[PDB]
């Protein structure tokens, strides 16, 4: 941490690209129940445990 | 002067440890920290480290000896026994 | 990184076919305690180190500037 | 004063991580990491450092010419001179004394 292996950084890359809200166009789509993103992992609330 | 009356070097221990024990440790530190004659170079330069080891300061030698003195009294007789025993092989 | 005292060694270096760049630097320093005078430094770039030549008397320096081969690219100051 | 920092990423005061403080041409104090000090080669027999040998770290000795690693005697960069002198004297005199051991037993074995 500040000096890392590669595997942990690869999972941080995935944890970055998932840390975003819904696309705005899905809420218009037919038969939609998804109203927000129920998996927003912040860094002040949830530690991902690698 | 003579700064201590009867403790000597064991005055570094102080008031602790009894009197007979400090007298007993004195008896062996006067042998241990002393400076002995080297039998080969003839110089009084033998000091010890590392109990049982007597390194000459000059002359590079090292005598494995007694732990506090260069050759203890129960050892220096043994070689005289050897001096008795090796003479009977020839005569 | 090196310093050269000889002149003919420097002339041997300027024709060594790796030396593509040289430069002439003109310093303004003072002799023994009194007077300002003109020092020059000839720096040839060998491919490993940068050789120099320190000339204090400029009466050798004008002859030496003339004595450089003209195929050598010279940065003047 | 100007308080300085480590340059590498090792924060502890180990034997590898030593620091000199140097003024740099920008005027500022800055740290310089200093390699451990090289030790002189020693005689294997008398323990004295033997002279004529450049004192370098052990992989520096492959960057150097052979005359900074050697003196011009037999047993040059390995043993100090006196010991070499002694192992000539001894190695002469016994190989004279042994010849005495070959001249006594030509006569004592013959006069028996």
């Amino acid at each position: 941490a500040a000096q890392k292996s590669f595997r942990i950084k690869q999972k941080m890359a995935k944890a970055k690209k998932q840390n975003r809200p819904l696309p705005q166009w899905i809420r218009l789509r037919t038969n939609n129940t998804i109203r927000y993103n129920a998996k927003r992992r912040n860094w002040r609330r949830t530690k991902m445990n690698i | 002067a003579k700064r201590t009356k009867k403790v000597g070097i064991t005055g570094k221990y102080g008031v602790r440890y009894g009197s007979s024990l400090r007298r007993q440790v004195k008896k062996l530190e006067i042998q241990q920290h002393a400076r002995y004659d080297c039998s080969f170079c003839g110089k009084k330069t033998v000091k010890r480290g590392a109990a049982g080891i007597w390194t000459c300061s000059c002359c590079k030698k090292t005598v494995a000896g007694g732990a506090y003195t260069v050759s203890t009294a129960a050892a220096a007789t043994v070689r005289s026994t050897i001096r008795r025993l090796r003479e009977m092989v020839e005569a | 990184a090196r310093e050269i005292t000889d002149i003919k060694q420097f002339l041997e270096l300027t024709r060594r076919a790796d030396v593509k760049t040289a430069t002439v630097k003109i310093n303004k320093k003072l002799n023994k305690a009194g007077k300002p005078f003109r020092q020059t430094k000839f720096k040839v770039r060998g491919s490993s180190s940068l050789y120099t030549l320190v000339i204090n008397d400029a009466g050798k320096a004008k002859k030496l500037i003339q004595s450089l081969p003209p195929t050598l690219k010279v940065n003047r100051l | 004063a100007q308080r300085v920092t480590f340059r590498r990423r090792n924060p502890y005061n180990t034997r590898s991580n030593k620091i000199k403080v140097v003024k740099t041409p920008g005027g500022i104090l800055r740290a310089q990491h200093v390699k451990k000090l090289a030790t002189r080669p020693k005689c294997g027999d008398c323990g004295s450092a033997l002279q004529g040998i450049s004192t370098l770290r052990p992989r520096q000795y492959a960057t150097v010419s052979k005359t900074h690693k050697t003196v011009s005697r037999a047993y040059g960069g390995s043993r100090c001179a006196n010991c070499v002198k002694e192992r000539i004297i001894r190695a002469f005199l016994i190989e004279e004394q042994k010849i005495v051991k070959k001249v006594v037993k030509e006569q004592t074995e013959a006069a028996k």
């Binding site: - | 400090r22 440790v25 030698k61 005598v63 050759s71 129960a74 050892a75 043994v78 026994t81 009977m88 | - | -």
Partner: protein
């Protein structure tokens, strides 16, 4: 962790050209540069190592083998020694006296080095403080301090 000092005696390998270094327990009074003679016909001087069938009785040897070739079992700690008190040349046995005062008959092909063991009189000095016993037992094993089982 050992009261006696060692002795790194170096021998010539008889079958390949090299030197083999061997760690004896130093007897008392072996200066460095002493030639140490291992073997049957070796003379009887302080530091030589000999078979027990080659020495006379009353000889004060140490580092003596139990069975011939286990390389130094009996009488190794500092100050100690065994004393050959008799021979039995029939079926080549030797009767010795161990440091505890137990007499014992062993084989006369076992090897003992002549002389008492260097470092003698090590426990005649008091160990005055607890820290000195700590620094004694930090180099042997974890057997200190001993809590009483009544406590």
């Amino acid at each position: 962790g050992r009261g006696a000092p060692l002795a790194k005696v170096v021998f010539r390998d008889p079958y390949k050209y090299r030197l083999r270094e061997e760690i004896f327990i130093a007897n008392e009074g072996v200066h460095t540069g002493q030639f140490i003679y291992a073997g049957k016909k070796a003379s009887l001087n302080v530091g030589n190592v000999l078979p027990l069938g080659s020495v006379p009785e009353g000889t004060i040897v140490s580092n003596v083998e139990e069975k011939p070739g286990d390389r130094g079992a009996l009488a190794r700690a500092s100050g100690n020694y065994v004393i050959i008190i008799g021979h039995n040349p029939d079926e080549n046995k030797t009767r010795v006296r161990l440091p505890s005062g137990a007499k014992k008959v062993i084989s006369s092909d076992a090897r003992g080095v002549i002389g008492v063991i260097a470092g003698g009189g090590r426990v005649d000095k008091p160990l005055l403080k607890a820290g000195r016993a700590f620094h004694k037992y930090r180099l042997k094993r974890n057997s200190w301090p001993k809590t009483r089982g009544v406590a």
